[PDB]
Amino acid sequence: PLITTETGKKMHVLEDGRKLITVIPGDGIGPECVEATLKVLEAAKAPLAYEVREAGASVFRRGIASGVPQETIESIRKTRVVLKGPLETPVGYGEKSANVTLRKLFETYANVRPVREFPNVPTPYAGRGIDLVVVRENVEDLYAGIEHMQTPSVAQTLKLISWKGSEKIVRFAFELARAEGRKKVHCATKSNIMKLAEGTLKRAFEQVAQEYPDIEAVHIIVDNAAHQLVKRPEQFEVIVTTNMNGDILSDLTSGLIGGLGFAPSANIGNEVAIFEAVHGSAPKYAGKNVINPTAVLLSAVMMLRYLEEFATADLIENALLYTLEEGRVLTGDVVGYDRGAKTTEYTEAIIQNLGKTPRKTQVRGYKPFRLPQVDGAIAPIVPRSRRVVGVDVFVETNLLPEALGKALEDLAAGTPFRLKMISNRGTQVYPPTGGLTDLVDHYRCRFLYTGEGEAKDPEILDLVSRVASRFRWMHLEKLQEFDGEPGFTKAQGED
Amino acid sequence: PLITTETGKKMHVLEDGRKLITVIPGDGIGPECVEATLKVLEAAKAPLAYEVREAGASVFRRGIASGVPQETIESIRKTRVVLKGPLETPVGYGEKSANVTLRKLFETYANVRPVREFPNVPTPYAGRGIDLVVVRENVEDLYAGIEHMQTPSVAQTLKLISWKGSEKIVRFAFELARAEGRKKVHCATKSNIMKLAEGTLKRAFEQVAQEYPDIEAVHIIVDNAAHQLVKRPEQFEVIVTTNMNGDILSDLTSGLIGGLGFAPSANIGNEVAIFEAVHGSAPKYAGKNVINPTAVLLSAVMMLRYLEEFATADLIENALLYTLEEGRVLTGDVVGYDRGAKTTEYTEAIIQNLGKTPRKTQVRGYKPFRLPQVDGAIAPIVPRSRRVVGVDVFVETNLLPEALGKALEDLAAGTPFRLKMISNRGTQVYPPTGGLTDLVDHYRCRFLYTGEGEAKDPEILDLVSRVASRFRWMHLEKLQEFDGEPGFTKAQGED
Ligand SMILES: NC(=O)c1ccc[n+]([C@@H]2O[C@H](COP(=O)([O-])OP(=O)(O)OC[C@H]3O[C@@H](n4cnc5c(N)ncnc54)[C@H](OP(=O)(O)O)[C@@H]3O)[C@@H](O)[C@H]2O)c1
Ligand SMILES: NC(=O)c1ccc[n+]([C@@H]2O[C@H](COP(=O)([O-])OP(=O)(O)OC[C@H]3O[C@@H](n4cnc5c(N)ncnc54)[C@H](OP(=O)(O)O)[C@@H]3O)[C@@H](O)[C@H]2O)c1
């Protein structure tokens, strides 16, 4: 049956004591990396039972667009613990990422990506003591993939950041820092540009920080953060950032200690945990028996510790590290593909080293920590007052700014709305600015309410119908104020 | 008077042959870096006339929210050439970036950020021959700053990518490659997740590439790209990417050769050119005469060559390089702020070296190239057919998915629309998926047209008014098909 440990984690413990997990082979190199891992697990006599289910490209090919079949959802709800190989996501077309789907379907909001130097895995940073962890928000931001072609030639993607999601991820980061003996957490954002969206993470970071006076909270702008991560990565311990930023920074850090073949990760939520490598399906290596399975193996190790199977975790992790320390069986990504050991040979070596322990690089098994509960989360605040002050109407037209401006002022005449300004790609173009801005066939037209109280729905739709009598609109955004503060930004160049 | 050179570039040439430029001191370290640069210029007898104007924080403090005063716009329209120090943008609140405003006001669509190893500027990558250039799209994507609080606790930023802007940036990259003798261009995108937005750059890249058979065009996913830039940066020559991706990758590359103190840049457009360092106003070093002015100096050098003042550019750049080669006067970012030379001393040393022989005469290899014209650009295609097939209605509510679904189906009864599904943060929650997705108070409700032809505006507004009779909507998106293909995506978990 499924049980809840004292740490609050959910896991399926079989009568014989073994823990049942869902295993997803994946696409490309996936199966090879997972196959290798399962062999090492069995050799180490890991107390596990396996429910193999599919996800990714193989499922897209069955005509299931989400790439996550019902049997796999059923299995994950049964086990609450998953070890998956990479899943292939078509580039530029096709189905949405099944990797993102798994995380969002099961609220595994935290993506933990630790990086450390490895024995006989040389990098220009060897000896600097790089030991940091990137805590990537895992379920919102841009990667949700909510897109709409505003016009035939203008595409739009929504970036959504919530207080709820930001509060969760920053709290997780602090708890993680406090659980690994780290006394500092960096929050990387682009809040100087996205004051509302990225600023939500910055503000959640600052408010939750007050509860962890034992940890130093430092905010850093994401670009300078990338620069610092390359120039002096040893200054970082824990870095928490939004989904997209985290995707790039975590891959940046992996290149500091050997590459993606050595980057494991854990997708953690309160109800489910998904362990997988940070790397992809890597189609050019699939089936060639040359791929490095270290990343997936180390992920299984993270899974073992999560499962409280610390002994097996140390055993497997020691074997791997011992194998690296000796430096006799190294994969192509470390010694070139003209010399690199085969995947199966690498596996066999590690297995042959089960029971052996490295002298230098050893297992740094931190202490488990209870995940923050919803009842202790900082709930979003309900404004004391709020009002709809206008509406942004997006239109598709090639009419020049000045003419569009006069046309809309005429259409709004008689309504309780006035055209305040018009922007193109976010740049004010009406009133004119004296600039030389090039224009696309998409314009955002800001109308402000001029009456008493607030703009009511009927009035807004009436304004939109008037605009529609001549122009094609495709996107509407209400402009609201919450506690006297506008819940929207000005255009670039707008005074 | 303002003239057009035989290369297409516009510059203000005075009666005496001097080229008039607009100079913006900036904020924080800005003034110090600019001040120094001007000193070196005057010493090198650069044939320039300066029109000093302000932008940035000092202007925000005058109550001009755009941070770009009219006199500065007037000056830029007059000179078409600008040398600016960094500008401070408030973090998480306040005014929008004046740096982004200048670029968008004057359509300086390409941000060229060259990176190379410098003498006596130690990095773990020294000797690997890193010599690449990031071509960052400069006027669209997320950095436009178009934001709306969908609900009091859910923020939204629009990511807009146009065919026009993407076509221009990739063509620029190819021309730049062909002009610097580079035989390869990498296009980094996240097209696997954002098939419409990021995919626009990918598709523009591939179609424009057909015009440059002499150049090898390679697409790479942005995350793997960061990994590769850290693991093996010497493989890259030219990298072209969207605005935000480029912001991060360019700073990542700067940390490979000395840090932001050595990263110059050029904001290029057809009508205007703005030269500035990649770094910011760096408030903690402001006024302490310790900041490294190299980045701004080299930007002035890029400016000089733009102005066709090649002799002065070589003179100044050789002096700088000679100074670094001698390694007698190095700034704090190179040898530590405990032994680093003062900004004024570093400057003095360079001026003293005006005329020396840099042993490794690595005056960068550059060849002027004509900017692509609009008449030669691939225009966006006008669909043969198009139709509105539905509407996405975003509502603010905490009513559970199941009940929200039933409520909306009831409201749509009688209309030529049906509720297809409902998502939360991009994840399908209605119909139920069997997942354990956490919900925020923002839901996207997809309605599909069920009649013949297409959904007309009056019918759409009628549906919205019915939804409004019970729920608060704040965001509408029409769903359109162009040439038989949906101009929108499915939700995560939606089959
Ligand atoms: N969580 C996931 O399941 C996940 C994460 C990322 C990408 N993907 C998917 O993967 C497909 C390919 O994407 P991609 O080519 O950009 O990236 P990728 O699969 O991570 O491959 C990029 C490069 O990383 C190196 N690498 C990755 N895994 C390695 C391993 N196990 N051992 C040794 N080297 C390894 C290789 O470098 P060299 O080429 O330099 O040898 C490789 O070509 C897509 O559909 C993508 O969406 C899935
Ligand atoms: N184009 C622009 O005008 C521009 C570009 C970026 C940021 N900004 C603005 O700048 C303000 C501060 O932002 P930030 O602190 O994130 O970044 P930043 O000003 O670039 O400073 C980050 C770090 O870069 C190093 N650095 C930058 N310029 C340097 C130079 N000339 N010489 C030596 N080292 C240098 C320093 O590293 P250490 O601390 O390690 O010494 C510095 O603290 C904000 O308002 C931001 O929006 C403006």
Mutate to test the pocket of ligand 1, among A253, A260, A324 (most ligand atoms within 8 A of CB): A260
Phi, psi for A468 (deg, rounded to 5): -65, -20
Enter the resolution in angstroms. 1.8
Experimental approach taken: X-ray
Return the HEC string of chain A. CEEECCCCCEEEECCCCCEEEEEECCCCCHHHHHHHHHHHHHHCCCCEEEEECCCCHHHHCCCCCCCCCHHHHHHHHHHCEEEECCCCCCCCCCCCCHHHHHHHHCCCCEEEEEEECECCECCCCCCCCCEEEEEEECCCEHHHCCEEEEECCEEEEEEEEEHHHHHHHHHHHHHHHHHCCCCEEEEEECCCCCCCHHHHHHHHHHHHHCCCCCCEEEEEEHHHHHHHHHHCHHHCCEEEECHHHHHHHHHHHHCCCCCHHHCEEEEECCCCEEEEECCCCCCCCCCCCCCCCHHHHHHHHHHHHHCCCHHHHHHHHHHHHHHHHHCCCCEHHHHCCCCCECHHHHHHHHHHCCCCCCCCCCCCCCCCCCCCCHHHCCCCCCCCCEEEEEEEEEEECCCCHHHHHHHHHHHHCCCCEEEEEEEECCEEEECCCCCCCCCCCEEEEEEEECCCCCCCHHHHHHHHHHHHCCCEEEEEEEEEEECCEECECCCECCC
A110 is written with which tokens?
């935290």
Query: Which chain B residue is nearest to residue A428, measuring alpha carbons?
Result: B105
Contact B33, B291 (CB under 8 A): yes
Residues making up chain A, counted from first to last: 495
Q: Do B157 and A200 touch (CB under 8 A)?
A: no
User: Within the 332-391 window of chain B, which residues sit less than 8 Å (CB to CB) from chain A?
Assistant: 380-383, 386
- Find all residues with CB under 8 Å of B360, minimum gap 6, and list them: B119, B321, B325
A461 is written with which tokens?
């739709």
- Find all residues with CB under 8 Å of B26, minimum gap 6, and list them: B33, B34, B55, B56, B84, B85, B86, B87, B88, B281
Residue keyed to tokens 């780290």: A182
Q: Do A96 and B490 touch (CB under 8 A)?
A: yes
- Residue A61 burial (10 A CB sphere; 0-12, 13-18, 19+): exposed
- Residue B373 burial (10 A CB sphere; 0-12, 13-18, 19+): exposed
CA-based nearest residue to A146, from B218, B189, B491, B5 = B491
Residue keyed to tokens 């005075």: B14
Closest ligand to B99 CA?
A: 2
Cβ < 6 A, ligand 2 pocket = A 192, 221, 224; B 29, 86-89, 99, 259-261, 276, 279-282, 291-292, 295, 333
d(CA A256, ligand 1 centre) in Å? 16
Distance CA A244, CA A249 (A): 9
**A190 in active site:** yes
- Residue B289 burial (10 A CB sphere; 0-12, 13-18, 19+): middle
Rounded to the nearest 10 degrees, the angle between the axes of helix B30-43 and helix B343-352 is 20
| Spacing of C-alpha B89 from chain mean position | 15
Give the N- to C-terminal CA distance of chain B in Å, as an integer: 63
Distance CA A380, CA B31 (A): 42
Q: Do B425 and A153 touch (CB under 8 A)?
A: no
Distance CA B402, CA B318 (A): 70
The number of beta carbons lying within 10 Å of the beta carbon of residue A381 is 11
Amino acid at A58: S
Amino acid at B191: S
d(CA A82, ligand 2 centre) in Å? 42
Amino acid at B63: G
Nearest-CA residue for ligand 1 atom 43 is A282
CATH 3.30.420.40 corresponds to the domain B385-495: no
Compute the Cα dihedral for B146, B109, B251, A158 and give only its sign.
positive
Contact A180, A236 (CB under 8 A): no
Instruction: Tell me which chain A residues have a C-beta less than 8 angstroms from the C-beta of B164.
Output: 153, 438, 440
Torsion angle defined by CA atoms of residues A146, A150, A155 and A158, in that order, rounded to the nearest 10 degrees: -30
Q: Does A139 touch chain B (CB under 8 A)?
A: yes
Contact A74, A46 (CB under 8 A): no
Residue keyed to tokens 């600019």: B34
Q: Which of A105, A255, A465 sits opposite B493 (nearest CB)?
A: A105
Distance CA B284, CA B29 (A): 9
Contact B387, B483 (CB under 8 A): no
Contact B41, B50 (CB under 8 A): no
Catalytic residue among A19, A84, A143, A346: A143
Contact B320, B349 (CB under 8 A): no
Distance CA A188, CA A225 (A): 7
Q: Which residues are registered as beta bridge partners of B458? A: none
d(CA B280, ligand 2 centre) in Å? 4
Residue keyed to tokens 């080299």: B298
Nearest-CA residue for ligand 2 atom 5 is B280
Phi, psi for A483 (deg, rounded to 5): 60, 45
Instruction: Tell me which chain B residues have a C-beta less than 8 angstroms from the C-beta of A164.
Output: 153, 438, 440
Compute the Cα dihedral for B346, B348, B351, B353 and give only its sign.
negative
The number of beta carbons lying within 10 Å of the beta carbon of residue B116 is 17
CA-based nearest residue to A53, from A39, A70, A30 = A70
Determine whether the annotation assigns residue A192 to a binding site. Answer: yes
- Find all residues with CB under 8 Å of B375, minimum gap 6, and list them: none
Compute the Cα dihedral for B236, B237, B239, B245 and give only its sign.
positive
Rg of chain B over CA atoms, in angstroms?
26
- Report in angstroms the alpha-carbon separations of A18 from A37, A47, A304: 18, 5, 12
Nearest-CA residue for ligand 2 atom 41 is B333
Closest ligand to B266 CA?
A: 2
| Spacing of C-alpha B43 from chain mean position | 33
How close is the nearest chain B Cα to the Cα of A142, in Å? 8
Distance CA B484, CA B386 (A): 7
Phi, psi for A173 (deg, rounded to 5): -60, -45
d(CA A161, ligand 1 centre) in Å? 27
d(CA B340, ligand 2 centre) in Å? 18
Contact A452, A485 (CB under 8 A): no
Domains of chain B, residue spans: 1-384, 385-495
- Residue B362 burial (10 A CB sphere; 0-12, 13-18, 19+): middle
Q: Is any atom of ligand 1 closer than 6 Å to the C-beta of A298? A: no
Contact A34, A296 (CB under 8 A): yes
B155 is written with which tokens?
């923020």
Contact A200, A162 (CB under 8 A): yes
CA-based nearest residue to A436, from B24, B244, B76, B162 = B76
How close is the nearest chain B Cα to the Cα of A16, in Å? 28
d(CA A314, ligand 1 centre) in Å? 27
Residues making up chain B, counted from first to last: 495
Closest ligand to B221 CA?
A: 1
Residue keyed to tokens 């629009």: B158
User: Within 13 Å, how many C-alpha atoms sit on residue B361's CB side?
Assistant: 5
Catalytic residue among B9, B190, B202, B420: B190
Distance CA B148, CA A479 (A): 7
Distance CA B136, CA B239 (A): 8
The architecture (CATH level 2) of B1-384 comes to: 3-Layer(aba) Sandwich (3.40)
Return the HEC string of chain B. CEEECCCCCEEEECCCCCEEEEEECCCCCHHHHHHHHHHHHHHCCCCEEEEECCCCHHHHCCCCCCCCCHHHHHHHHHHCEEEECCCCCCCCCCCCCHHHHHHHHCCCCEEEEEEECCCCCCCCCCCCCCEEEEEEECCCEHHHCCEEEEECCEEEEEEEEEHHHHHHHHHHHHHHHHHCCCCEEEEEECCCCCCCHHHHHHHHHHHHHCCCCCCEEEEEEHHHHHHHHHHCHHHCCEEEECHHHHHHHHHHHHCCCCCHHHCEEEEECCCCEEEEECCCCCHHHCCCCCCCCHHHHHHHHHHHHHCCCHHHHHHHHHHHHHHHHHCCCCEHHHHCCCCCECHHHHHHHHHHCCCCCCCCCCCCCCCCCCCCCHHHCCCCCCCCCEEEEEEEEEEECCCCHHHHHHHHHHHHCCCCEEEEEEEECCEEEECCCCCCCCCCCEEEEEEEECCCCCCCHHHHHHHHHHHHCCCEEEEEEEEEEECCEECECCCECCC
CA-based nearest residue to B132, from B238, B44, B230, B32 = B238
Contact B454, B444 (CB under 8 A): no
Q: Is any atom of ligand 1 closer than 6 Å to the C-beta of A265? A: no
| Spacing of C-alpha A197 from chain mean position | 15
Distance CA B157, CA B164 (A): 21
Distance CA B398, CA B381 (A): 42
Rg of chain A over CA atoms, in angstroms?
26
The number of beta carbons lying within 10 Å of the beta carbon of residue A91 is 17
Contact B107, B271 (CB under 8 A): yes
CA-based nearest residue to B319, from B36, B87, B106 = B36
How close is the nearest chain A Cα to the Cα of B447, in Å? 14
Torsion angle defined by CA atoms of residues B295, B299, B301 and B307, in that order, rounded to the nearest 10 degrees: -170
**A430 in active site:** no
The number of beta carbons lying within 10 Å of the beta carbon of residue B444 is 25
How close is the nearest chain A Cα to the Cα of B76, in Å? 9
Distance CA B421, CA A414 (A): 38
- Residue A444 burial (10 A CB sphere; 0-12, 13-18, 19+): buried
User: Which residues of B fall in the annotated binding site for D-threo-isocitrate?
Assistant: 97, 99, 103, 113, 136
Residue keyed to tokens 């014209």: B373
**B141 in active site:** no
Determine whether the annotation assigns residue A166 to a binding site. Answer: no
Instruction: Tell me which chain A residues have a C-beta less than 8 angstroms from the C-beta of B429.
Output: none
Residue keyed to tokens 């290029």: B268
CA-based nearest residue to A427, from B144, B422, B121, B346 = B144
Q: Which of A146, A457, A473 sits opposite B465 (nearest CB)?
A: A457
Bridge-based pairing state of the strands A472-482 and A427-430: unpaired
Compute the Cα dihedral for A313, A318, A323, A324 and give only its sign.
positive
d(CA B435, ligand 1 centre) in Å? 27
Amino acid at B363: V
Q: Which of B146, B193, B438 sits opposite A143 (nearest CB)?
A: B193
Compute the Cα dihedral for A297, A301, A307, A312 and give only its sign.
positive
Mutate to test the pocket of ligand 2, among B35, B121, B279 (most ligand atoms within 8 A of CB): B279
Contact A273, A266 (CB under 8 A): yes
- Find all residues with CB under 8 Å of B414, minimum gap 6, and list them: none
Q: Do A252 and B229 touch (CB under 8 A)?
A: yes
- Find all residues with CB under 8 Å of A33, minimum gap 6, and list them: A26, A85, A86, A277, A291, A293, A295, A296, A297, A343
Instruction: Tell me which chain B residues have a C-beta less than 8 angstroms from the C-beta of A113.
Output: none
Catalytic residue among A195, A223, A288, A337: A223
**A141 in active site:** no
A175 is written with which tokens?
């708890």
Compute the Cα dihedral for B56, B61, B63, B65 and give only its sign.
positive
Distance CA B91, CA B102 (A): 18
Q: Is any atom of ligand 1 closer than 6 Å to the C-beta of A260? A: yes
Mutate to test the pocket of ligand 1, among B192, B220, B224, B231 (most ligand atoms within 8 A of CB): B224
- Residue A81 burial (10 A CB sphere; 0-12, 13-18, 19+): buried
Distance CA B116, CA B301 (A): 15
Phi, psi for A456 (deg, rounded to 5): -90, 155
Contact B347, B306 (CB under 8 A): no
Question: What is the phi-psi region of residue A332: left when phi exceeds 0, alpha when psi lies from -120 to 50, beta otherwise?
Answer: alpha
Compute the Cα dihedral for A121, A122, A127, A128 and give only its sign.
negative
CA-based nearest residue to A419, from A428, A430, A427 = A430
